[PDB]
Design a protein around this ligand. Sequence first.
Ligand SMILES: *Cc1cc2c(cc1C)nc1c(=O)[nH]c(=O)nc-1n2C[C@H](O)[C@H](O)[C@H](O)COP(=O)(O)OP(=O)(O)OC[C@H]1O[C@@H](n2cnc3c(N)ncnc32)[C@H](O)[C@@H]1O
Ligand SMILES: *Cc1cc2c(cc1C)nc1c(=O)[nH]c(=O)nc-1n2C[C@H](O)[C@H](O)[C@H](O)COP(=O)(O)OP(=O)(O)OC[C@H]1O[C@@H](n2cnc3c(N)ncnc32)[C@H](O)[C@@H]1O
Lengths: 525, 525
Amino acid sequence: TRTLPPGVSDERFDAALQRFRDVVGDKWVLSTADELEAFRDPYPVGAAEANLPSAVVSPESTEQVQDIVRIANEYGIPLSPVSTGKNNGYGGAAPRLSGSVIVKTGERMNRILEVNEKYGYALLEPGVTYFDLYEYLQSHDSGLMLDCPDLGWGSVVGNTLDRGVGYTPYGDHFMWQTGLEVVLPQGEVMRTGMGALPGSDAWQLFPYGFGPFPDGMFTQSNLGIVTKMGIALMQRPPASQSFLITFDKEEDLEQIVDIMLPLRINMAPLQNVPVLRNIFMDAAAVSKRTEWFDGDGPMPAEAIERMKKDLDLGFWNFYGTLYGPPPLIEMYYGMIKEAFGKIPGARFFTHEERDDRGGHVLQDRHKINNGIPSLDELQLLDWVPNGGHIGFSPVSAPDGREAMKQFEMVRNRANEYNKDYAAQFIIGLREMHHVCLFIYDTAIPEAREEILQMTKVLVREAAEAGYGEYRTHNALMDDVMATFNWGDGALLKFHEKIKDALDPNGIIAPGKSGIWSQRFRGQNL
Amino acid sequence: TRTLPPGVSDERFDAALQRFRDVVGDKWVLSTADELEAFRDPYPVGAAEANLPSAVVSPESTEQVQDIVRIANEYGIPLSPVSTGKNNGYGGAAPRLSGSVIVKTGERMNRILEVNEKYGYALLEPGVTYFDLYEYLQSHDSGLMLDCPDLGWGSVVGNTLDRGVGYTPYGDHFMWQTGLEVVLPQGEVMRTGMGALPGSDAWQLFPYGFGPFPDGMFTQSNLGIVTKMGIALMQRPPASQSFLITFDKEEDLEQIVDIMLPLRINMAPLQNVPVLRNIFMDAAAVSKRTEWFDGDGPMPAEAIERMKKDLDLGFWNFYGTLYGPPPLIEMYYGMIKEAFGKIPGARFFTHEERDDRGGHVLQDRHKINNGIPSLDELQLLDWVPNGGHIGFSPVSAPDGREAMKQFEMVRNRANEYNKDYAAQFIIGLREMHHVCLFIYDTAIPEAREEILQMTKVLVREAAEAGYGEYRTHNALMDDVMATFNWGDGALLKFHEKIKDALDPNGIIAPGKSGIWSQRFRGQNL
Ligand SMILES: *Cc1cc2c(cc1C)nc1c(=O)[nH]c(=O)nc-1n2C[C@H](O)[C@H](O)[C@H](O)COP(=O)(O)OP(=O)(O)OC[C@H]1O[C@@H](n2cnc3c(N)ncnc32)[C@H](O)[C@@H]1O
Ligand SMILES: *Cc1cc2c(cc1C)nc1c(=O)[nH]c(=O)nc-1n2C[C@H](O)[C@H](O)[C@H](O)COP(=O)(O)OP(=O)(O)OC[C@H]1O[C@@H](n2cnc3c(N)ncnc32)[C@H](O)[C@@H]1O
């Protein structure tokens, strides 16, 4: 069965494809089953096929994006914009609504438009990856550093548009975004902030401009197709030092988090975004499950102890990085050792003190925390055959008790559905993103189904407990949006009203973040 | 003539007033000319009467705000929400559209809902002033400090809603805003972020929630009436030190800014928001114009030399504050002395070194920069009889040539229209808010029209040079918004569409930020 936009005939679709090829050129429109396989979710969730694209269109310019959008409006064809389309764990490039055309802006709009050394920023097209920006900065001998997520192959822009995160002091990517250019759902182009002022040099200097401040509305959003974005870049410090603290017990989570808060809330002595990773996360980065346990079920405790002993890691492993002149690093490290050294069984290691296998994660963090992009974390996906993951990502207060409750709630469903729970707390000033990655064999229909059902349960149970997700998978966007329903779904109704006003024909990424335009509401898509 | 809402009769307005009284109480609805005098712009702009309220309603609660909004929809009555209505320099409490009813939320919705010591936040109603919050923190022996603008009588909430600024490291108020509750234009209530998740404790912990991030759309905005807002609060550091650098020559501006940028962009050694104030700003804070000059026209060079010599101040005066352990402060201050000391004629003073009349501004800044609110700056308005100001507030790159260009441009016109130009550059990481206060005799219709005409010319002339304003007066909002016209006025068209979608009846603060709903567009008020 050929994949078709909803309500659009074989004939009408064929004509639209031709219109698209007129805009972007023949090579840059894909529509055959073989070509579209590469744009399916690499880590499919649920037994049944879902999230099927009808085509991929690769524009080279904003003008072409505007014409594509105009064509889509005429035919009623949905358009799902992506940058590099590496949102793996949340759907990959795949559209929320089957039958949508992917607009893969980053294939050809991949220019670094500006890196400004004096004011420390970049103006970027969506195709710029973190590796690309890294190469630029190195080549020019920049005094700037980037902030990258765990995997460097994504888009500086794309990641920011999903409010993704890295681990330097610039880790909150949307916080550092300054200025954007967007194609709105009927094809009009708009610049935000000081970019709305012709001839301004301040587009990447002052984010707000004048009047209502809208850039946030284009994040986790279906209100347009972004074609340019600025981002502030931090100055590279003179020196840095990373460290690991291993903690022996599952139960240490509470005290680790409680001790952490006062050292983090003022951005010193914990300067970077610390990560607190469980043994499953760290073992999966350097080893296969079968090294520790052959068995269909939850890993017994003795296999867990062997993981820890062989990798010389704790159940909970805390990684951080310090920056500045060497005497500042030594003061801050001293404080960190003193505070966390109050937990029995804690041991400390700098990035100069491990050369073993279990220390590979530390060396990888030391790269990432210094703005050096890496793909070593891809090795997690070799944990089991045909490995995929999904991200269940609740927000947590920086409170040890809350963090333990979340860990216990997630652990228990993980056990019930037979899926390993790899945990990574990403610690902001006043909150943590509690990222729960579930690694599974994507070829087994039953495992894909258990992933879906387990995660649907976790979203509901976490919400009954007062926790919501910061970000989620295509498969869960409706369920997650249904949890933010204070005042009888006030927030959703507001988003629908705006959606319907800007997108009267229901073209752009319908269903993103549970937000469906009028023509799609009330349906089972 | 009685001031009446456009298109609304005496009889209908009388009916709507009684309904307002049914909601809030007779005592809480003001509608006589005498009662309304105190809600006129205290620093009026233009010779002709403008910005006339028809009434003032003071609601006790969110529910009452909802009822008021419902009434105003049924009767076609525009509503102008304020918190404390101290937006002096930009309109005071007066509505952009004459005939609107002011909803003074802050009169009775003035509760501190929560101050959380552990996570460092406050949840506030709109009537909490900076003084009120300071008093709370002092009374409870808090380890937190607030961040305040120059005058403490404003609203933590109201100031943030106009994207106002203060001077500690938390001086970007909008950056630290975390969660809000808002009554939308037809009377529905919504909570943003994690507050949309029933029972979440993270409303003031994690700003974004899930899906498109909307809070910024309620700043400089007419999309709702805000009833609660969260803000982060910084921990008080163990020590601080403030300093003043005087620079003798107007031409020193370029070099000052160019030396400043590398000391600021990393937040160290310039940790706080420095301010660079000219002699007219500082002299006006401590003296009357007639002490220095009592002739016609702009002050002569000799008179300016006298202000400087008598006050022991420069033409340009740089104020900053340093925070932390004493050895860190000393290291940072040594670095600041070394850099700025290259400018011939620069002199340095700490808050411990000057107790004279000229040093009164340094003493005030030492309070403000440590979150101690003050009203001493109100003395600026005694510079001339019936004194008032208007703020012309262009954004500048943190570049000396740019700042110098802006200063000369503004000075040329100030001189041409015989208005004294007091300057305060407010220095962010990558930008400056170049606040130009023109102080004038508000009683004289000539002076008020010259203010109006001069500022209109400056808005145009700045925009021709590629500069736009971050914030502006009622009288200038149309003109300022007209400058942000990239892409054939795309930004404004986008705002108008959202406005019409959320506010089908055109009720909330029509004209705020140049954004008029359909029923008022093209009418010229
Ligand atoms: C499997 C995995 C994933 C992962 C990770 C570790 C592992 C093992 N670590 C991450 C980390 O440390 N931090 C983080 O933010 N994410 C992490 N992930 C998830 C994922 O790898 C990355 O976030 C990746 O960077 C995201 O993919 P990409 O950068 O390629 O972004 P995209 O797929 O193009 O876009 C994502 C969504 O944003 C909207 N979007 C994107 N571009 C546009 C344009 N131009 N216009 C409008 N909307 C756009 C779409 O919603 C798109 O789906
Ligand atoms: C004359 C002057 C002004 C001044 C200053 C020094 C002098 C001599 N120094 C300032 C500074 O250091 N920083 C700063 O941000 N502003 C400074 N000003 C300007 C003014 O004093 C202050 O900003 C003052 O804090 C603002 O007044 P207030 O705080 O009372 O705020 P408001 O008048 O109530 O509200 C302003 C606008 O915001 C919108 N608003 C307010 N509340 C609501 C609600 N609840 N819902 C919807 N919108 C709201 C309106 O647009 C309102 O007009």
